[PDB]
Symmetry: C2
Subunit: 252 residues, 2 copies
């Protein structure tokens, strides 16, 4: 249908609609409010008049045009070709499931701990802190700990924050520290100094999170996307092989 | 020159070179190492064979091709048109200079201070801290300050970091705090409590930076780019006006 005429010539809703369809992302031109339709019609007419003026200035013979049009024409055909190939790719339920089942033990959230620490240079300093805190529990142990860390900790990274280290996993830090911190019960301190390259630590564990299993439903779309893409690449490279072999090719 | 033949047909270095010129970003095909040339020739032959296969499958009549080619053809012409317009745009030295001179007082780096503070709830607590620090100077004033902030400051945002606030300007915070902190000399404290909505502060100023003038040479390219772009938009929109007026347009 004709939504405008320009120097006598009809502009359809069809051509306006097709021009803007990329930008509309699936919303149909016809469903826009009258004033949005009108703005898009104006914009399209302006595009149309710039085209007429460009031809009037013979810009279709400009090599900036013909060379880029040659390029676009080849690139669009190659893309349509690879798109027909993409449309033959389907991963059935069983492959998706089968990939999950095969990798089940890698679809996990790793165990974490939330802890504070106090660092000091000497085994005996660490025992004395341990002493000062012996027999205390819960939020009282926590407050006193942090106060001791601010007071006596030699770790510049945390001393000021009451020894806070936040949540962390086993990948994160040195095993001997990691070992003691995973072994503790929540709300408790290392009753023996932990020895590292940094010195002697006292650790207070606030919380823990056990290794968690990720479920198939959580990851299945991701698995499918990744299998489709791998399959697409295999089919495309195979094709690229059939065509090359097939041809007689000499390098000069 | 012929770098390969494919089923008898010659492939020039010219067409390979033109195909990859976008990706080469100005480096000439001819200057690449032999093994890079060869890989690009292979890639180009593969592109060529996919084109031949696409035509064999009649994909040039596919509407996924013809409709996108119609779109590309219009979009490239419009771009060549606006590119010829872009090429007529020049800002002479005098406009660039003139814009700088006109806005000289906005091309400045604002004054900054680097300070610590201690916050307490009561004017008298603030005087007593001021007391404890009276008569101290330099790095000794600094250490004692930070220790007092850790000890007695009621600001959770900084208390733990010895009251550190880092570098900040006048836009950043409440004027009454800002006022006192800009007035101080480096290495000194507010000898009178500063009153805000948060309570009573003692401020130690570590450093200052005076308002700095940005020089023409620092900003001149930026000014030019921005003037060229504004001018481009003016010329393009004017054009868009000449064309529209010029036409006889009826909206249905």
């Amino acid at each position: 249908a004709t939504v405008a005429t320009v120097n006598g010539k009809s502009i359809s809703d069809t051509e306006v609609s097709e021009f803007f369809a990329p930008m509309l992302r699936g919303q149909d031109f016809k469903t826009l409010p009258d004033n949005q339709k009108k703005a898009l019609i104006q914009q399209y007419i302006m595009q149309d008049l710039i085209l007429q003026d460009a031809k009037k200035q013979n810009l279709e013979k400009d090599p900036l045009y013909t060379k880029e049009l040659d390029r676009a024409k080849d690139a669009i055909l190659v893309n349509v070709y690879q798109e027909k190939i993409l449309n033959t790719i389907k991963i059935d339920a069983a492959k998706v499931k089968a990939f999950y089942d095969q990798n089940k033990d890698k679809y996990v959230k790793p165990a974490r701990v939330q802890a504070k620490h106090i660092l000091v240079a000497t085994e005996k300093e660490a025992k004395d802190i341990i002493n000062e805190l012996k027999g205390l529990k819960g939020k009282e142990l926590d407050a006193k700990f942090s106060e001791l860390a601010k007071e006596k900790s030699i770790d510049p990274g945390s001393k000021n924050q009451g020894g806070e280290l936040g949540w962390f996993d086993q990948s994160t830090m040195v095993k001997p520290f990691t070992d003691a911190a995973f072994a503790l019960k929540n709300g408790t301190i290392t009753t023996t100094p932990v020895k590292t390259n940094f010195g002697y630590h006292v650790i207070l564990k606030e919380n823990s999170q056990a290794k968690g299993q990720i479920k198939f439903d959580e990851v299945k779309q991701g698995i499918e996307n990744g299998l489709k893409f791998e399959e697409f690449k295999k089919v495309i490279n195979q094709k690229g092989q059939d065509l090359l072999n097939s041809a007689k090719v000499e390098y000069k």
